[PDB]
């Protein structure tokens, strides 16, 4: 199990090979943030796989130099490039050499023989390496490394440095210069170390912190200040100073952030009349169907749940799960009655009697085919319904053919009347209650729509959610898009109106189309952050002033200037020292 501890200042390294002198330099580079968790480990009486993340850190406390190895990569089957590093009798021995792995890669050590510890070939860490895209050869103490893959460059850094501490990373600051760069080109996702089997070691994970760094005369980093560590350490990154003299500074800007979101589309009122399509008592026939365009309405696809509903609701263009927010453009419900087995003949990549002659939908067609049984209703039987039995060829997409001309089977002209080899193209279905389910006329609709690529008229049905007040949220109201804090208001909006607005033209109010009421708006918060500090010559204790806000969204006080954290109010009044605002002056005294 991990037994954590506190990183302190460890893991600062020269981000490049440049030299400088006595110049505070703010660099934004993956580091080990100050004062964070470090997953710790042992060698006792233990070296699992870890994540490699963006980079790593490392250390160990070696009198005996037992932690000698590293194995990185994606997999550890060799299906990656399998990196490696080994350290033998002070001789640096590296590879990328790639092999089949093992369960307990390790190193052997023996007790008190002529050759110390023996097992210098111990090295059943894997089976055998093959294709090597690089090669090389060569508590009292402390090691520190850093391993980060960037631009195919797996870097390394190090300090082999003495200490006296048993328990943890000593407190202190030492930069890490680079040793190597390998252009290995792997992407390491993990790794494992390799112990010496009869020695603590640590791990961080590099994060994109921004440090202020202080080079010295010789150009050895003597010190650093994380920017994001805490209120004060952002005032040193602003000033580029390790001495922050007295008085109020300004660093960051905090912005309250949206809770979830609010969609609003008018409920009820009017919608896309799916019912004025679907429950029409008699649909048009199959040779001639009903194309009824649907435009500029909140879609009705809700109510399609509770009803007799459909024989099937089947979407050939797009998922019905998409349809809800999916914005159509040109909406066409295809309203007609056919015999039952012909719902199989209305679909893309489908042939048969219907799809060839009296009704056609594309094989790239965009829509949803809908049908349900009219056995209960249309029949009495029902001869109002009919199909075109013969035509000379196969139809085009969306050609309603109402032409009643007689199909001529033979060479002799029919002269407009039936006869030998003259077939009446239009054959009715008698729907008789004594005929089965496959013969049942199904009451058929097909959504025929364009998806995107035409301007916005119809959207999917209402995704409009519930409404939340007095709480910073994101919202969209009927195409009005914005972010703010909705409340109840008293501004009497005009009945035929929609938006309120303001003197700078910015939206100042709205109306809720589902229940008409007047909601104000208001930006999130803003305010700047102002660190109020006595000089770092005196105390690292700072007192932050969040300006121009009310104290929630954050020992708290409240000013006329803003939300002031970390300074106890005082009923005295003294001469001004560090002025804050609205006549409130801080100071450092007891």
């Amino acid at each position, epitope marked *: 199990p991990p037994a954590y501890t506190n990183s302190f200042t460890r893991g600062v390294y020269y981000p490049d090979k440049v030299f400088r002198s006595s110049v505070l330099h703010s660099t934004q580079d993956l580091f080990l943030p100050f004062f964070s968790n470090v997953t710790w480990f042992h060698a006792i009486h233990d070296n699992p796989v870890l994540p490699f993340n963006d980079g790593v850190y490392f250390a160990s406390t070696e009198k005996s130099n037992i932690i000698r190895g590293w194995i990185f990569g994606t997999t550890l089957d060799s299906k990656t490039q399998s990196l490696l590093i080994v350290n033998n009798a002070t001789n640096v021995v590296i590879k990328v050499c790639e092999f089949q792995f093992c369960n307990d890669p390790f190193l052997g050590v023996y007790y008190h023989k002529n050759n110390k510890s023996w097992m210098e070939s111990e090295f059943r860490v894997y089976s055998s390496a093959n294709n090597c895209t690089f090669e090389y050869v060569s508590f009292k103490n402390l090691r520190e490394f850093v391993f980060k893959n960037i631009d195919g460059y797996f870097k390394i850094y190090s300090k082999h440095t003495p200490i006296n501490l048993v328990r943890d990373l000593p407190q202190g600051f030492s930069a890490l210069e680079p040793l190597v760069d390998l252009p290995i080109g792997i992407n390491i996702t993990r790794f494992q170390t390799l112990l010496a089997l009869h020695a603590a070691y640590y791990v961080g994970y590099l994060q994109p912190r921004t440090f202020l760094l202080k080079y010295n005369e010789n150009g050895t980093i003597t010190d650093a200040v994380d920017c994001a560590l805490d209120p004060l350490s952002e005032t040193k990154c602003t000033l580029k100073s390790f001495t922050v003299e007295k008085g109020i500074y300004q660093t960051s800007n905090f912005r309250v952030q949206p809770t979830e979101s609010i969609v609003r589309f008018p409920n009820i009122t009017n919608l896309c009349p799916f019912g004025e399509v679907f429950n029409a008592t008699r649909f048009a026939s199959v040779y001639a169907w009903n194309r009824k365009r649907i435009s500029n309405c909140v879609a009705d696809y809700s109510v399609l749940y509770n009803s007799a509903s459909f024989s099937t609701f*089947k979407c050939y263009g*797009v998922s019905p799960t998409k349809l809800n927010d999916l914005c159509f453009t040109n909406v066409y419900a295809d309203s007609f009655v056919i015999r039952g087995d012909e719902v*199989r003949q209305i679909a893309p990549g489908q042939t048969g009697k219907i799809a060839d002659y009296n009704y056609k939908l594309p094989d790239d067609f965009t829509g949803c085919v809908i049908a349900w*049984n009219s056995n209960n209703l249309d029949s009495k039987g029902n001869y109002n319904y009919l199909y075109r039995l013969f035509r000379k060829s196969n139809l085009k997409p969306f050609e309603r053919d109402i032409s009643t001309e007689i199909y001529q089977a033979g060479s002799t002209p029919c002269n407009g009347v039936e006869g030998f080899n003259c077939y009446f193209p239009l054959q009715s279905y008698g729907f008789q209650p004594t005929n089965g389910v496959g013969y049942q006329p199904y009451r058929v609709v097909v959504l025929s729509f364009e998806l995107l690529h035409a301007p916005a008229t119809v959207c999917g049905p209402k995704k409009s959610t519930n409404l939340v007040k007095n709480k910073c949220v994101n919202f969209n109201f009927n195409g009005l898009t914005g972010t703010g804090v909705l409340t109840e208001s008293n501004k009497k909006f005009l009945p035929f109106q929609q938006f309120g607005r303001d003197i700078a033209d910015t939206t100042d109010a709205v109306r809720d189309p589902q229940t008409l009421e007047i909601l104000d708006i208001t930006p999130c918060s803003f305010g700047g952050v102002s660190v109020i500090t006595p000089g770092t010559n005196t105390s690292n204790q700072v007192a932050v002033l969040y300006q121009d806000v009310n104290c929630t969204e954050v020992n708290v006080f409240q000013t006329r200037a803003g939300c002031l954290i970390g300074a106890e109010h005082v009923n005295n009044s003294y001469e001004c020292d560090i002025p804050i605002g609205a006549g409130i002056c801080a100071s450092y005294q007891t």
Partner: antibody
Amino acid sequence: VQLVQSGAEVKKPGATVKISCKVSGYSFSNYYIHWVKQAPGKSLEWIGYIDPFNGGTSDNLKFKGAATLTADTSTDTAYMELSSLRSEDTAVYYCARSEYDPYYVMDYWGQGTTVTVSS
Amino acid sequence: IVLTQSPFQSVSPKEKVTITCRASQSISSNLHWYQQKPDQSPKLLIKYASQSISGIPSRFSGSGSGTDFTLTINSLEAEDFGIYFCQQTNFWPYIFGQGTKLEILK
């Protein structure tokens, strides 16, 4: 006729268990593959039928995992990748071959995919 | 589309068990049936509620009238026991029958 599916899983709530159902013994393209949710200690509950030629699929409202049934015609695999995962999304999900009409006839489903969805 | 089945019916060998799928509100002629032995792929007994799909024994039979949809099972055998599911057809997506666990006496 025959369906080979994804392996056993333990899934985070909110994660996505991707259950492949690969068509063997019949033609992927001629059949809706229905999907059904049998959770441990529960009965069959409809989630959705896929169409093999038609990416658009009816999904269940009910429990809604934003289930998207993707019809893979190269490997003849109807996928159910169930998002919005939950301890009740621990379940044996049977992909069910059936006709492409409003004829839904499903006999030998997937062998079952025993997928725990849990923390 | 709402239906429900009896949670279980415990019947005796050689007795006939007609398992009830009773649909709420609207109904269509098509309906389907199952037996599922625990933790197994449900096997379709009946098709369109009027047809036992091929491969299903003659003791498993099916019918329906209005809201009533029946799996008529006859002369139980001690090995037969399982969980019996039904399927509402059309009229919007479906509630599978909650199943009949077959507990056979004797």
